[PDB]
């Protein structure tokens, strides 16, 4: 019934400290919210969890001392605070809770019994540990060529995501966001593409709608057809 | 060494079916319940199974869990293209208070359509080559199975340096899709009749070819 929505992606140097908010859309005080990230490259592991109603919080071994989770009741909003940060710990982080209901909740079990399989999740916040500088894209129009593919190129950006939209969403059909290649530079680089009708080249308008929010930067670019006798500069 | 062990792949074909195993011990699955988690590439994971084998709204009664002694098992019949997926066992462990998972198990239908990768290529556009660098873009996609091998050439000359090319992903639609780039200086892209991506596929090689004199 509830759902859970978590902070922006984020990024740290190594040693210091990430916090993720995970706020939930109506009261979830009962049962333990848990904590599970996601290495790239890695299975799911388990960080901990805190049953909200009593505070009281269940960590993994490899965590403890660095790990701590709050709830606040008053604002249904759970954290993870993680401390001391390494490379290893460049993963995305999910909270997650249990859609269960009680006829009598109980005021006095073991901490285990309010832990439950996970059928809400949050969408997940994408944490980069680096000593990388932080550095967002540059983005080119791909002008187009019974269908026309046209695009946008998503140049040298760090660290993930990046997110791309078309006219600020009002087109989804024919959108095909590919995977970012992770360049000799260390930086990434993507393309959007739009698979459109060619006849309506003449008229329609297309415009991608960058967002990299690490770097807090957006870019708009409008992608028209390549014009052979008039070559522009600025 | 996940506390509970899973073996780290399965398959199937079309219609067939699986059962993937997920062992532990006493202070674990012994005296606890289990649960199934899927997960897909680029979204949260989702509950399959809970208290060992109950199935949670919605799941299909082709999915199915059991538990007995200190292991446990996902069984999947009717095996579709969307079933490909990490799968994951999980319990509470009394002995470390806590929430334990298995270390997954990939499970990959095969057998699926053979299909030939459709290729765009776009040529640098005029923004960048102002900006003194030149990127060719080659987009892949809608392949299966999902491995290929990208070459660019020059006119008619192979291109090894600059070049960056991702490995294969699994589009929605369950076949894939990969890209290509290759770096130039604008003095090179001008200086060439064309340049070209070609895609190798299952031995069968496509290619696109732009030129800096299109519009």
């Known amino acids: 019934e509830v759902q859970l929505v978590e902070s922006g992606a984020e990024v740290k140097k190594p040693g210091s400290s990430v916090k993720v908010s995970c706020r939930a859309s109506?009261?979830?005080?009962?049962?333990?919210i848990n904590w599970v990230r996601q290495a790239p490259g890695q299975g799911l592991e388990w960080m901990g969890g805190?049953?909200?109603?009593?505070?009281?919080?269940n960590y993994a071994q490899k965590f403890q001392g660095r790990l701590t989770i709050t709830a606040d009741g008053s604002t249904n909003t759970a954290y993870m605070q993680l401390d001391s940060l390494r490379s290893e710990d460049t993963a995305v982080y999910y909270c997650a809770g249990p859609s269960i209901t009680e006829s009598h909740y109980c005021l006095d079990c073991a901490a285990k019994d309010y832990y439950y399989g996970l059928d809400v999740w949050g969408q997940g916040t994408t944490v980069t540990v680096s000593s990388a500088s932080t550095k967002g894209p540059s983005v080119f129009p791909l002008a187009p060529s019974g269908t026309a593919a046209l695009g946008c190129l998503v140049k040298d950006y760090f660290p993930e995501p990046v997110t791309v939209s078309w006219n600020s969403g009002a087109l989804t059909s024919g959108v095909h966001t590919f995977p970012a290649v992770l360049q000799s530079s260390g930086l990434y680089s993507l393309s959007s593409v739009v698979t459109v009708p060619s006849s309506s080249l003449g008229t329609q308008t297309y415009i991608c709608n960058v967002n990299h929010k690490p770097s807090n930067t957006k870019v708009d670019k409008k992608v028209e057809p390549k014009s052979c006798h008039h070559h522009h500069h600025h | 060494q996940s506390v509970l062990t899973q073996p780290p792949s399965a398959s199937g074909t079309p219609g067939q079916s699986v059962t993937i195993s997920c062992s532990g011990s006493?202070?674990?699955?012994?005296?606890?319940?289990v649960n199934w988690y899927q997960h897909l590439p680029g979204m949260a994971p989702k509950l399959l199974i809970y208290?060992?084998?109950q199935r949670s709204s919605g799941v299909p009664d082709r999915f199915s869990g059991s538990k007995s002694g200190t292991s446990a098992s996902l069984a999947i019949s009717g095996l579709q293209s969307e079933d490909d997926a990490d799968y994951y066992c999980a319990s509470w462990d009394d002995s470390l208070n806590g929430v334990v998972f298995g270390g997954g198990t990939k499970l990959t239908v095969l057998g699926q359509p053979k299909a030939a990768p459709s290729v765009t290529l776009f040529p640098p556009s005029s923004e960048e080559l102002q900006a003194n660098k030149a990127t060719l873009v080659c987009l892949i996609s809608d392949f299966y199975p999902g491995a290929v091998t990208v070459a660019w050439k020059a006119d008619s000359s192979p291109v090894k340096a600059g070049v960056e090319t991702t490995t294969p992903s699994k589009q929605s639609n369950n076949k894939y899709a990969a890209s290509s780039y290759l770096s130039l200086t604008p003095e090179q892209w001008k200086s060439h009749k064309s340049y070209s991506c070609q895609v190798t596929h299952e031995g069968s090689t496509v290619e696109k070819t732009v030129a800096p004199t299109e519009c």
């Open positions: 805190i049953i909200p109603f009593f505070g009281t919080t």
């Open positions: 109506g009261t979830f005080y009962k049962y333990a």
């Open positions: 208290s060992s084998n």
């Open positions: 006493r202070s674990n699955i012994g005296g606890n319940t």
